[PDB]
Design a binder for this molecule. Structure first.
Ligand SMILES: Cc1cc2nc3c(=O)[nH]c(=O)nc-3n(C[C@H](O)[C@H](O)[C@H](O)COP(=O)(O)OP(=O)(O)OC[C@H]3O[C@@H](n4cnc5c(N)ncnc54)[C@H](O)[C@@H]3O)c2cc1C
Ligand SMILES: Cc1cc2nc3c(=O)[nH]c(=O)nc-3n(C[C@H](O)[C@H](O)[C@H](O)COP(=O)(O)O)c2cc1C
Length: 471
């Protein structure tokens, strides 16, 4: 393309980093990436379980059979009649290409799998090594932009500490600029004809929770303090449709920090910890109480009903075999006192359980016996406990509690990642796009683990491809 005014990308999470990379590298369209925070990455850079793909090279290598049709089936089942089915079709159909894009353009291995809740087969990809998938992916995409910037400053600029506050439109009805507050709190306008909102969810915002899901306002969150629904609000005021805003995902397993127990913010206990073999024990009885691998709305409901009203937490207990397949991650959690390695005898006392050690042993064994029926219907039992586990055998334990995690609602988009006008199927503006958690309609009533990083890549690429047709 001939260089004109920049495309403004709002937010440097995976949706924004995807959109920017695709614009600059495929089309040589100039980008200005604005983020109101002090650093790149949003909640994306903190993501720990991985990114979904159906029918990938990694699945083939590991002899997992998966299709876009099965992924779509799991996604429609998760959605429970909410959202836009054709966007779920797109999300799942283009996921093979998403994983391939990360592997071929950025040499991300993505060679390991985990099966998360609501998934029929393992399709959540992560790379072997020390780096969790959120950080590995953000790091690689940001490094590419920074390299490109250093060679051609006009092709991409990243501007941090820049909070977008509005979009300016001409008489009817085109984008002419982006209004933002710079590092010094001064109003600035970035002149532009194309803007992509990649500004994330609203899960941290107590006021938006009061408006859309009032019964969640006292729950802790995994979200960073930047997660305040800015783009949703800005776009709704400009006349965009919002959809499914009252669909807020509460993740069942945020870690409790033993030295800061009532912190409103929690580290997340990656769902892979359960997918790869971890179980949940009741915090008083020391006994399993539910299917740990169902969808997040269902596991959370079980914890909130079966664990004590006051003191609503559970014990996440992981075997040596879980540790061997998730070593670096668990080592990290241990470094933050979030997981402790303990003998079964000490587990009983350190967590004030009613069960005897010998009784807990009997339980772990029958859970691990996969020739014995599972009390709670768990669809996948791998890396369970040693058959001759004794009271002095060690396990890994963390304390977990439900947390506000993800907002499925947001601005309505179409298949081109264009923002849809309120009460209409026409676009609000030829130059307004959105991608990632700021958008609504992709997940419906519940998001499958692994599909939010996926959404970022699929719809970020889409926004870039479609701006390229118009630029
Ligand atoms: C602990 C945690 C763990 C997670 N683990 C996984 C996982 O394992 N697998 C998976 O698929 N997903 C996971 N997710 C969700 C996922 O990682 C992303 O958060 C999600 O995909 C949204 O990405 P995003 O690009 O839309 O938004 P974000 O990554 O949140 O980035 C949005 C950016 O927009 C900036 N911004 C916000 N408002 C403005 C404004 N007015 N002006 C300018 N900039 C603004 C923000 O500062 C932020 O940097 C996890 C999320 C969290 C919090
Ligand atoms: C396995 C693993 C899981 C992590 N989980 C979270 C998390 O849930 N929430 C979060 O904010 N950061 C998470 N992080 C990020 C760390 O808090 C930290 O930002 C990162 O390790 C960078 O190290 P630093 O503190 O020296 O900057 C995780 C990191 C790893 C390696």
């Amino acid at each position: 393309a001939s260089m004109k005014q920049p495309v403004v990308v709002i937010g440097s999470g995976l949706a924004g980093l995807t959109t920017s990379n695709r614009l600059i590298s495929k089309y040589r369209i100039p980008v200005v990436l604005l983020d109101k925070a002090a650093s790149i990455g949003g909640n994306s850079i903190k993501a720990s379980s991985g990114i979904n793909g159906a029918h990938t090279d990694t699945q083939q290598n590991l002899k997992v059979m998966d299709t876009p049709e099965l992924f779509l089936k799991d996604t429609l089942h998760s959605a429970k009649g909410r959202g836009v089915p054709s966007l779920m079709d797109k999300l799942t159909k283009e996921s093979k290409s998403a994983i391939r894009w990360l592997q071929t353009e950025f040499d991300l291995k993505l060679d390991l799998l985990a099966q998360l809740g609501g998934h029929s087969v393992p399709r959540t990809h992560r790379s072997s090594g020390k780096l969790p998938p959120g950080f590995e992916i953000v790091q690689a995409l940001s490094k590419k932009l920074k390299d490109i910037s250093s060679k051609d400053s006009n092709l991409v600029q990243i501007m941090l500490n820049s909070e977008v506050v509005d979009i300016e439109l001409d008489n009817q009805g085109h984008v002419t600029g982006v209004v933002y507050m710079d590092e010094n709190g001064n109003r600035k306008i970035m002149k532009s004809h194309h803007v992509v909102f990649c500004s994330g969810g609203f899960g941290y915002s107590k006021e938006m929770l009061k408006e859309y899901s009032p019964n969640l306002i006292h729950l802790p969150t995994t979200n960073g303090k930047q997660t305040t629904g800015d783009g949703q609000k800005i776009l709704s005021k400009l006349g965009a449709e919002l959809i499914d805003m009252d669909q807020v995902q509460v993740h069942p397993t945020g870690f409790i920090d033993p030295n800061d127990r009532e912190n409103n913010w929690k580290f997340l206990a990656a769902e892979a910890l359960r997918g790869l073999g971890g179980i949940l024990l009741h915090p008083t009885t020391g006994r399993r109480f539910t299917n740990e691998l169902s969808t997040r709305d269902t596991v959370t409901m079980e914890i909130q009903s079966k664990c004590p009203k006051n003191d609503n937490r559970a014990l996440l207990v992981m075997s040596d075999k879980v540790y061997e397949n998730y070593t670096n991650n668990i080592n990290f959690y241990m470094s933050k006192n979030l997981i402790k390695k303990v003998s079964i005898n000490d587990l009983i006392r350190q967590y004030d359980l009613q069960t005897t050690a010998s009784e807990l042993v009997t339980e772990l064994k029958s859970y691990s016996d996969v020739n014995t029926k599972d009390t709670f219907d768990r669809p996948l039992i791998i890396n369970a406990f040693d058959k001759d586990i004794s009271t002095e055998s060690t396990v890994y334990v963390g304390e977990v509690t439900p947390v506000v995690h993800f907002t499925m609602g947001g601005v309505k988009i179409n298949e081109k990642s264009q923002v849809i006008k309120k009460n209409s199927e026409s676009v609000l503006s030829n130059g307004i796009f959105a991608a990632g958690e700021v958008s609504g309609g992709v997940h419906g009533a519940n998001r499958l683990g692994g599909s939010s990083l996926l959404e970022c890549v699929v719809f970020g690429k889409t926004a870039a491809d479609n701006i390229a047709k118009l630029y």
